[model samples]
Target: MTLKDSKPELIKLYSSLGKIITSSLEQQEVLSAVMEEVRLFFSPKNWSLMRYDENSEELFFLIAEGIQFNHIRSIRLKSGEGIAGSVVQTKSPIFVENVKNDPRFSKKVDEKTGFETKTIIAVPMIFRGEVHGVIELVNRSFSPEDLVILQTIADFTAISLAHSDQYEKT
Candidate 1:
């Protein structure tokens, strides 16, 4: 479904995204709000926000939901290591119905966190032609509307981060 065909909740989600972007909230607060919105919308078994570390060409967990381990914050992946990494490296979106059967799926995370993933939708967060990060939802079946909604949120995240940078300097 296109944005024109989005549901009422999806439309409300966009409104929330706008509020989060325009608010003078810190980086972590913005991310937390976005993740919470996503959680309510998708109801995924697991989700995470991974921010790109350009200097290291890695994506580290900025925030994770539905996981039981605090060490999840320490998990990092190379630019093309796993599903999330591949999304960032390619600057594209990927929706997998059976993550275990996909070659791009990495078991290292499940091995560490012990949270099994069966499905996934990974989308890159890009702004002004720069790849900023990726948003991932696991064990969820996504529709076209879902992708549209999440991608828009990711776009808003980039904008919020850029604004935060300017805000920090002042």
Candidate 2:
């Protein structure tokens, strides 16, 4: 169990998380599982999943891993307003090694949660040409292998969430 040989373990964990996301029919359950998986790998003090509120043209926080639910509930980020908002607005990903150094980092969130900011990787969860939500891992250091693993897991989780939402609509 050398340091260099742990990639396989992370890969296996990612694969298992993917499978869980795919088979979980409930949207909330899928998100819960996704966040839990992320926390297990990254060990971040906090993590969250935020979905776009089309009617309000804002991002709404849905799930939090390693943090208080009340802290994130119904939180809003206007389109293009912050890091997460920009990801949703542009339908792309952003990797920042130091959040406090970035001018675009939103301090409002930290103010509310009382958690200091650090590195983050945020990706828009797009499915079928629509942005379903944004997945972000917070305060984790940059490990090349960890970034690759997180991105891969996020991609699969997005796909699963999209399908899970569709099932409820139909």
Candidate 3:
């Protein structure tokens, strides 16, 4: 967040952070609103939450915000397949400043959607002993600390992710 950036968005995110701790039935709604604040905070062009499907062992977009989600929604990545998949597979984070140069980067989605992704920072959402999936940010360069903020944001969702498949089935 810079001087040119909206501090109000960050304030909203901090306010949204409190809601996640109380464990609501409206987890998806509040969570999306929190990530929406994140989207507004960075205005990262696009942001998405890829939830893991235990049945298929794949990652699919559960919540996505931005213009290109429609084109990419149908796309899924097998575990260990793409940057986001790799995060799920290993239960770790991956930050790539240039997807064009990263071997771990998957071009298949870009090929399918023609969105031309430039950067990626995918953080895993893990709680207890299980890995839920990842929170993905696109076209934004990480400031190291900025990456930490994303990780913490992902952490904030673990309780809700653990609390409900109610949101999932609906």
Candidate 4:
């Protein structure tokens, strides 16, 4: 079920992601749905939500899609290691069109999985001024409308991921 390049359709998909983020209390549950939903919307090759662990100072891939099973499962990126790490460390979002051109890209996973990445959108998950994690859609196309919708969805997801109590049920 691939989505066409239509603004209304993208908006609907973005709204759906937002609803899923708010409705699910469990972090893994939300991430699972987010992966499938966004895949259908944008035709991305892969997507993942890397959760930042403060205790271990690492990012763990809690839910992943379109990635090979034998690839890198998780990594403790330094504060400025990769796109996701930089987003968390700098508290900024990044849209990279050429993965190979970015010096920050860590190719261990891609090399292991034999997946070629062209573009990526990485957004930091922040709450109350602290960055907790990052949400990323890898190998996705960038459209004006698509970018806008993704940013909106990322904002809500960031908030939800950061403040688990707000969305997570007891």
Candidate-wise lDDT, in order: 0.79, 0.76, 0.74, 0.71
List model 3 lDDT by residue over 54-119, tens digit each.
789988877766646777788888988889988887788888888878877889877867777888
The candidate 4 region of ten consecutive residues with least summed lDDT is 161-170
What are the per-residue Cα lDDT tens digits for candidate 4 across 68-130? 654667445767778888887888888898988999887766776788778879877666676
Question: What are the C-alpha RMSDs, in order, of all predicted structures?
Answer: 4.5, 4.5, 5.9, 5.9
How high is the lDDT of residue 133 in model 3?
A: 77
TM for every model, in the order presented, reads 0.83, 0.77, 0.77, 0.73
Error of 3 at 37 (Å): 3.3
- Model 2 CA deviation exceeding 4 Å by range: 1-15, 141-144
Stretches of candidate 3 off by over 4 Å are 1-23, 166-170
lDDT (Cα, 0-100) at 169 in candidate 1: 82
Q: Which candidate number would show the highest TM-score if scored against the true structure?
A: 1
Q: Which has the higher lDDT value, candidate number 1 or candidate number 2?
A: 1
Which is better, 3 or 4, measured by TM-score?
3
Give the Å shift of residue 47 in candidate 2.
Answer: 1.2
* lDDT score for candidate 2 against the true structure: 0.76
